[PDB]
Design an enzyme around this catalytic site. Structure first.
Site, PDB file in Angstrom:
ATOM      1  N   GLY A  83     -49.429  28.618  80.785  1.00  0.00           N
ATOM      2  CA  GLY A  83     -49.381  27.379  81.529  1.00  0.00           C
ATOM      3  C   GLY A  83     -47.975  26.824  81.557  1.00  0.00           C
ATOM      4  N   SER A  97      14.391  15.712  56.181  1.00  0.00           N
ATOM      5  CA  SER A  97      14.208  15.747  57.618  1.00  0.00           C
ATOM      6  C   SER A  97      15.404  15.123  58.324  1.00  0.00           C
ATOM      7  CB  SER A  97      12.924  15.028  58.013  1.00  0.00           C
ATOM      8  OG  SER A  97      12.788  14.981  59.422  1.00  0.00           O
ATOM      9  N   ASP A 109       4.366  18.713  69.299  1.00  0.00           N
ATOM     10  CA  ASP A 109       4.908  17.519  68.650  1.00  0.00           C
ATOM     11  C   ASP A 109       6.277  17.867  68.073  1.00  0.00           C
ATOM     12  OD1 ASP A 109       3.697  19.257  66.926  1.00  0.00           O
ATOM     13  OD2 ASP A 109       2.512  17.753  65.866  1.00  0.00           O
ATOM     14  N   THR A 159     -43.872  34.799  79.326  1.00  0.00           N
ATOM     15  CA  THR A 159     -44.544  35.952  79.938  1.00  0.00           C
ATOM     16  C   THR A 159     -45.923  35.627  80.503  1.00  0.00           C
TER      17      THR A 159
HETATM   18  N1  LIG Z   1       9.008  22.277  53.180  1.00  0.00           N
HETATM   19  C1  LIG Z   1       9.536  21.052  53.150  1.00  0.00           C
HETATM   20  N2  LIG Z   1      10.776  20.894  52.638  1.00  0.00           N
HETATM   21  C2  LIG Z   1      11.310  19.671  52.608  1.00  0.00           C
HETATM   22  N3  LIG Z   1      10.785  18.518  53.027  1.00  0.00           N
HETATM   23  C3  LIG Z   1       9.557  18.705  53.531  1.00  0.00           C
HETATM   24  C4  LIG Z   1       8.878  19.906  53.625  1.00  0.00           C
HETATM   25  N4  LIG Z   1       7.630  19.715  54.199  1.00  0.00           N
HETATM   26  C5  LIG Z   1       7.586  18.427  54.430  1.00  0.00           C
HETATM   27  N5  LIG Z   1       8.719  17.754  54.052  1.00  0.00           N
HETATM   28  C6  LIG Z   1       8.979  16.327  54.176  1.00  0.00           C
HETATM   29  O1  LIG Z   1       7.808  15.626  53.796  1.00  0.00           O
HETATM   30  C7  LIG Z   1       7.345  14.803  54.886  1.00  0.00           C
HETATM   31  C8  LIG Z   1       5.841  14.789  54.896  1.00  0.00           C
HETATM   32  O2  LIG Z   1       5.400  16.116  55.214  1.00  0.00           O
HETATM   33  P1  LIG Z   1       4.241  16.361  56.253  1.00  0.00           P
HETATM   34  O3  LIG Z   1       3.122  17.023  55.549  1.00  0.00           O
HETATM   35  O4  LIG Z   1       4.747  17.125  57.478  1.00  0.00           O
HETATM   36  O5  LIG Z   1       3.830  14.918  56.750  1.00  0.00           O
HETATM   37  P2  LIG Z   1       4.180  14.504  58.206  1.00  0.00           P
HETATM   38  O6  LIG Z   1       5.329  15.331  58.675  1.00  0.00           O
HETATM   39  O7  LIG Z   1       4.575  13.001  58.226  1.00  0.00           O
HETATM   40  N6  LIG Z   1       2.854  14.750  59.201  1.00  0.00           N
HETATM   41  P3  LIG Z   1       1.441  14.887  58.279  1.00  0.00           P
HETATM   42  O8  LIG Z   1       1.326  16.260  57.700  1.00  0.00           O
HETATM   43  O9  LIG Z   1       0.185  14.603  59.186  1.00  0.00           O
HETATM   44  O10 LIG Z   1       1.486  13.821  57.117  1.00  0.00           O
HETATM   45  C9  LIG Z   1       7.989  15.402  56.128  1.00  0.00           C
HETATM   46  O11 LIG Z   1       8.135  14.422  57.150  1.00  0.00           O
HETATM   47  C10 LIG Z   1       9.339  15.879  55.594  1.00  0.00           C
HETATM   48  O12 LIG Z   1      10.287  14.820  55.544  1.00  0.00           O
HETATM   49  N1  LIG Z   2     -57.719  30.937  85.337  1.00  0.00           N
HETATM   50  C1  LIG Z   2     -56.738  30.444  84.544  1.00  0.00           C
HETATM   51  N2  LIG Z   2     -55.470  30.882  84.736  1.00  0.00           N
HETATM   52  C2  LIG Z   2     -54.459  30.424  83.975  1.00  0.00           C
HETATM   53  C3  LIG Z   2     -54.763  29.439  82.935  1.00  0.00           C
HETATM   54  N3  LIG Z   2     -53.600  29.158  82.333  1.00  0.00           N
HETATM   55  C4  LIG Z   2     -52.637  29.895  82.940  1.00  0.00           C
HETATM   56  N4  LIG Z   2     -53.152  30.650  83.920  1.00  0.00           N
HETATM   57  C5  LIG Z   2     -52.405  31.588  84.786  1.00  0.00           C
HETATM   58  O1  LIG Z   2     -51.023  31.656  84.434  1.00  0.00           O
HETATM   59  C6  LIG Z   2     -50.272  32.024  85.591  1.00  0.00           C
HETATM   60  C7  LIG Z   2     -48.942  31.288  85.597  1.00  0.00           C
HETATM   61  O2  LIG Z   2     -48.001  31.989  84.798  1.00  0.00           O
HETATM   62  P1  LIG Z   2     -46.659  31.224  84.387  1.00  0.00           P
HETATM   63  O3  LIG Z   2     -46.448  31.196  82.898  1.00  0.00           O
HETATM   64  O4  LIG Z   2     -46.699  29.826  84.936  1.00  0.00           O
HETATM   65  O5  LIG Z   2     -45.513  32.107  85.061  1.00  0.00           O
HETATM   66  P2  LIG Z   2     -44.145  32.269  84.254  1.00  0.00           P
HETATM   67  O6  LIG Z   2     -43.716  30.920  83.746  1.00  0.00           O
HETATM   68  O7  LIG Z   2     -43.089  32.830  85.164  1.00  0.00           O
HETATM   69  O8  LIG Z   2     -44.367  33.200  83.095  1.00  0.00           O
HETATM   70  C8  LIG Z   2     -51.129  31.663  86.793  1.00  0.00           C
HETATM   71  O9  LIG Z   2     -51.379  32.826  87.583  1.00  0.00           O
HETATM   72  C9  LIG Z   2     -52.439  31.159  86.234  1.00  0.00           C
HETATM   73  O10 LIG Z   2     -53.530  31.793  86.896  1.00  0.00           O
HETATM   74  C10 LIG Z   2     -56.166  29.010  82.790  1.00  0.00           C
HETATM   75  O11 LIG Z   2     -56.508  28.185  81.926  1.00  0.00           O
HETATM   76  N5  LIG Z   2     -57.071  29.544  83.605  1.00  0.00           N
END
Ligand SMILES: Nc1ncnc2c1ncn2[C@@H]1O[C@H](COP(=O)(O)OP(=O)(O)NP(=O)(O)O)[C@@H](O)[C@H]1O
Ligand SMILES: Nc1nc2c(ncn2[C@@H]2O[C@H](COP(=O)(O)OP(=O)(O)O)[C@@H](O)[C@H]2O)c(=O)[nH]1
Lengths: 822, 114, 104
Positions: free
Chosen positions: A208, A754, A794, A205
């Site tokens: 300088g 799986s 995936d 507001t």
């Molecule tokens: N609800 C489930 N019932 C039966 N088998 C499951 C189930 N969830 C996971 N599996 C088996 O467990 C394995 C590992 O599970 P999962 O957590 O999905 O590992 P991921 O599939 O290899 N990917 P990530 O989770 O990153 O390890 C799967 O690949 C399935 O063969």
């Molecule tokens: N005379 C005088 N004026 C100053 C001084 N410092 C700042 N000003 C005034 O500050 C004004 C600039 O306002 P500024 O902040 O740059 O505008 P804004 O950034 O849009 O808010 C100018 O009109 C200067 O005259 C000072 O030390 N002496």
């Protein structure tokens, strides 16, 4: 098995073994393995060094010695084997990755895991291992380096970078991880230094802010926009340094767009307006708090801009209250007249330059960083295109940009170009938003001061306005204004709150939560209101009150407290089930906003106290007792919260239905009573090990529980649960229970495992109609997910979970819908 | 007759538990033929059905070992229109058995069991 | 100890919360129904508002999260059931108005 030491002749007359695996056994040494091995799995054994007997198997193909107490790795000129393909050495006390003797012998190596170790530096001879596929050097936290020679490992598709110091830190992550090799390669091509950073002049507001900028560069209206300029600094230490100055607007009407232009790689100045001494310093505190919430690591050099008047010891409050209390790193301060030159202004130039040369976030020295020359050539091209494109429309089409880069012989293909323009937007040369929700994929604003003077021009009942006055790109205006939080305008919108009444006031059916912060950040309320319209919403500047019913409403107010300087944010909701749903959605929205926009708050006092209110006596609560949310979350084992005596208590779902998983639809309550389950025995772990998948009996039926490790967040878990709560397709793995103590998940149990294991081991079962039933069920699941307006991203035989092998069954195949959760 | 028509698998399974409550060999043999016989690939898949024991008289008929209503139907729709190789798979796994010795004796099943 | 006489007289004198000096700025309200067929509107066009009009109206209208201001009520029970006794002003019209919005 609890074996200590194998016999010396244990595999003496077995000259055909291949896959001798002895995992988590108390083993120390390998006594004479046969020469016909291919893969060994000796992980989690009490090893001190790689035993010499394994270093002589002339056909070794894989080796799992992860989580062993081994120190030295023998180099590639001792292995005596020419088919090494998978060396895994996670969680070991290994220090050196010595690959200097004869590194070409490991050319056929595919995977290589050196995570969770005390590695010092990746050696630059790594570049010859042309067949690396998954190099794992994550979780070291002592590396802080990457050799430019590893840009040749083009076969790498994944590269874990979890919890390690960095050098470029270019905001591009290893989510692609092949672009990282592209950047390393292009840096290996040219490797030119870079000298450019931002200097955001910050004040308010009339101070300088412009005259100081006119004197500083050795060169009056108030600022409209942010008025992007730049000036070079010829450092004699011959360092040609240019930095662009962004003298931000002073008036509060523009205070809802400045967070779009406050980055972490910049040096800020804060201006006093020292005419009104000892109070303007107190008025400067919201600016410093906003700098802290936006850029937590950037220094700020204060300037007093009235040495024509005096209030001379106004530095007392600066030295006392403004040093370190949750405010950014004030590296220095000065006082100047800022109208003509002086020794103070000259030393201001010198200190600004000296603080610019030593920015060094994470000790990286960003003032002199290294980039490929393609970036600097693109910079010179675009800076010449600013003068080559007239002031009527400096926006640049994407195909025009491609024609510009094809007009010259740069090595920039379309692959690295998104990171190229992202890095150039990082250094403030052309502003471009790659957000696909915006129509800016073909909009590349060269000369961003035009954009800031235009998009802030609009700010020059009480507050709303429809379409009322640009060559037919008006929808770009409106979409940008929505992106810039301008649209109805949230700023200049009816600061007076109305005298609202509420139908529920008996102080027991009302859940309240506070979000006490020292000040409101700059563009907070606009971003909140915009992200909360997703219901006669009778809002104002600092509230919403969207209301569906006396039985269902919300009120995101901003309460202020008696004798409390810190601001607040008061969420009022009724205490029915719909109230808990609304409260959970609102809290998740707010936390996502703070994590995505103001990370400086949610970091360590933590600067943001999430409270909770509760009443003991229903009605006449007599100033409901504040309770911090953190230890209330820590009181999860006790599902009731009680006073000093147990004559009363309150359930946690009553006053915090987001910690207790009740804000989501209650069909997925954990219900730990009938869970016959033991995470210890690996009998049940045989249902899956890559994920912590077990087998358990719950509610009488058999389930396949999934225990969450500490890689997940409770809020992220809840986000995963709400989308997974209401799918319910017969070809989908339904959920049965989920909750805390521990963070677990109860999904249904596929009997036959799986599909991939089935076709691997029992291929005689696929009989031209079981194949067709599986395909039809998977197609049904995919069609349901596409009618669920979500992707899977995936699909593989690792996810097709079968339930029976009878061809004429109701359900046969089911897919794992946890892939949409990540 | 009722099983050749459309009957829900949950209904047949619940009725199988009913008819195994009052154990009668012929009816539960018919229900198991509708449920867990896959003749296309010589496959018995008597899996997740939690039956207590197993009698060799039950799965006995599973191994390979009058046009009255149709003419009545044809007449009444005319009036309606005028007015208008051994099986080698045996899987008995999730059934919570306690003694398989009932199958051990030389029943009428052993030629198939060989 | 005649304070309840004070309060009863102030209620009788339309002072009680005070209807005067009450938040002249109207809020930026939205409505769930805007398709211009399910909304009944009625005007009560008068040259000026009489002196103690709005206080007497608001006091005689509390008989429902009433989010009122100086010249409105908006008591709301539901999107299916609400009311809004606003005070609309018209373009190029010196005469005041009183706009009653209700669903149909
Ligand atoms: N609800 C489930 N019932 C039966 N088998 C499951 C189930 N969830 C996971 N599996 C088996 O467990 C394995 C590992 O599970 P999962 O957590 O999905 O590992 P991921 O599939 O290899 N990917 P990530 O989770 O990153 O390890 C799967 O690949 C399935 O063969
Ligand atoms: N005379 C005088 N004026 C100053 C001084 N410092 C700042 N000003 C005034 O500050 C004004 C600039 O306002 P500024 O902040 O740059 O505008 P804004 O950034 O849009 O808010 C100018 O009109 C200067 O005259 C000072 O030390 N002496």
């Amino acid at each position: 098995n609890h074996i200590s030491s194998l016999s010396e002749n244990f595999l003496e007359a077995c000259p055909k073994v291949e896959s001798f695996s002895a995992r988590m056994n108390f083993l120390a040494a390998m006594p004479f393995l046969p020469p016909s091995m291919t893969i060994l799995k000796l992980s989690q054994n009490k090893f001190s060094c790689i035993p010499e007997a394994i270093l002589n198997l002339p056909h070794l193909r894989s080796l799992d010695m992860s989580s062993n107490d081994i120190q030295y790795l023998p180099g590639p000129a001792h292995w005596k084997s020419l088919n090494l393909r998978e060396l895994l050495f996670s969680h070991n006390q290994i220090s050196i990755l010595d690959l200097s003797e004869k590194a070409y012998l490991w050319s056929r190596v595919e995977k290589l895991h050196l995570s969770h170790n005390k590695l010092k530096e990746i050696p630059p001879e790594i570049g010859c291992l042309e067949n690396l596929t998954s190099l794992d050097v994550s979780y070291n936290l002592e590396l802080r380096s990457f050799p430019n020679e590893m840009g040749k490992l083009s076969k790498i598709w994944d590269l874990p970078l979890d919890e390690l110091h960095l050098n470029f830190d270019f905001k591009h992550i290893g989510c692609k991880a092949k672009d990282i090799i592209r950047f390393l390669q292009q840096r290996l091509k040219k490797a030119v230094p870079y000298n450019r950073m931002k200097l955001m002049i910050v004040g308010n507001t009339g101070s300088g802010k412009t005259t100081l900028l006119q004197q500083l560069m050795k060169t009056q209206s108030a600022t409209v926009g942010i008025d992007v300029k730049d000036w070079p600094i010829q450092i004699r230490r011959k360092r040609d340094l240019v930095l662009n100055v962004w003298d931000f607007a002073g008036r509060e009407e523009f205070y809802s767009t400045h967070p779009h232009f406050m980055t972490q790689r910049a040096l800020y100045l804060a201006v006093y307006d020292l005419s009104k001494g000892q109070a303007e310093v107190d008025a400067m505190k919201p600016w410093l708090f906003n700098i802290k919430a936006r850029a937590s690591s950037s220094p700020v050099i204060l300037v007093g801009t009235h040495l024509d008047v005096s209030k001379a010891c106004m530095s007392k409050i600066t030295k006392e209250l403004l040093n370190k209390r949750g405010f950014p790193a004030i590296r220095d301060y000065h006082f100047v007249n800022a109208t003509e030159e002086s020794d103070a202004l000259a030393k201001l130039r010198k200190t600004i330059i000296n603080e610019s040369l030593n920015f060094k976030i994470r000790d990286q020295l960003v003032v002199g960083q290294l980039i490929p020359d393609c970036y600097v050539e693109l910079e010179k091209i675009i800076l010449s295109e600013r003068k080559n494109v007239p002031i009527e429309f400096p926006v640049i089409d994407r195909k025009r940009l491609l024609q510009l880069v094809r007009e010259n012989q740069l090595q920039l293909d379309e692959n690295e170009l998104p990171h190229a323009v992202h890095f150039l937007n990082e250094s403030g040369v052309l502003l471009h938003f790659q957000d696909p929700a915006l129509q800016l994929s073909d909009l590349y604003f060269v000369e961003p001061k035009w954009l800031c003077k235009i998009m802030a021009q609009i700010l020059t009942p009480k507050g709303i306005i429809s379409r009322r006055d640009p060559k037919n790109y008006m929808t770009q205006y409106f979409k940008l204004l929505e992106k810039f939080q301008i649209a109805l305008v949230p700023s200049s919108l009816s600061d007076h709150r109305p005298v609202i009444e509420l139908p529920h006031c008996e102080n027991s059916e009302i859940i309240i939560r506070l979000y006490e912060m020292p000040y409101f950040p700059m563009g907070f309320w606009s971003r909140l209101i915009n992200r909360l319209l997703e219901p006669n919403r009778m809002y104002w500047r600092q509230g919403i009150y969207l209301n569906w019913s006396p039985e269902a409403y919300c009120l995101v107010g901003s309460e202020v407290l008696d004798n409390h300087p810190e601001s607040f944010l008061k969420i009022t909701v009724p205490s029915c089930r719909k109230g808990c749903i609304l409260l959970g959605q609102v809290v998740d929205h707010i936390d996502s906003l703070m994590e995505e926009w103001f990370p400086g708050l949610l970091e360590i006092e933590t600067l943001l106290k999430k409270w909770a209110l509760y009443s003991f006596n229903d009605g006449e609560e007599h100033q409901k007792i504040l309770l911090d949310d953190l230890m209330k979350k820590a009181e999860e084992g006790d599902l009731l919260v009680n006073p000093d005596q147990p004559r009363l208590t309150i359930p946690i779902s009553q006053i915090a239905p987001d910690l207790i998983l009740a804000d989501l639809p209650r069909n997925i309550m954990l219900n730990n009573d009938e869970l016959e389950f033991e995470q210890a025995p690996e009998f049940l772990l045989g249902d899956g090990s890559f994920g912590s998948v077990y087998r358990a009996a719950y509610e009488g039926e058999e389930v396949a529980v999934k225990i969450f490790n500490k890689h997940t967040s409770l809020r992220l878990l809840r986000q995963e649960l709400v989308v997974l709560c209401h799918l319910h397709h017969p070809s989908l793995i339904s959920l049965l229970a989920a909750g805390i103590r521990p963070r677990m998940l109860v999904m249904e149990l596929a009997s036959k495992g799986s599909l991939d294991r089935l076709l691997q081991q029992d291929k005689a079962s696929l009989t031209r109609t079981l194949q067709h039933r599986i395909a039809l069920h998977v197609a049904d699941g995919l069609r349901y997910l596409h009618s669920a307006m979500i992707i899977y991203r995936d699909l593989k035989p690792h996810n097709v979970l079968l339930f029976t092998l009878y061809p004429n069954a109701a359900i046969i195949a089911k897919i794992a819908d946890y892939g949409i959760a990540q | 007759l009722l099983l050749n028509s459309g009957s829900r698998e949950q209904d047949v399974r619940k009725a199988l538990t009913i008819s195994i409550g009052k154990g009668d060999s012929q009816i539960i043999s018919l229900l198991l033929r509708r449920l867990a016989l896959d003749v296309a690939n010589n496959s018995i898949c008597l899996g997740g059905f939690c039956i207590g024991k197993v009698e060799p008289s039950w799965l006995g008929p599973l191994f390979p070992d009058t046009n009255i209503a149709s003419t009545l139907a044809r007449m009444v729709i005319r009036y309606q229109m005028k007015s208008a190789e051994y099986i080698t798979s045996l899987d008995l796994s999730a059934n919570e058995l306690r003694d398989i010795d009932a199958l051990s004796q030389k029943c009428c099943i052993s030629v198939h069991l060989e």
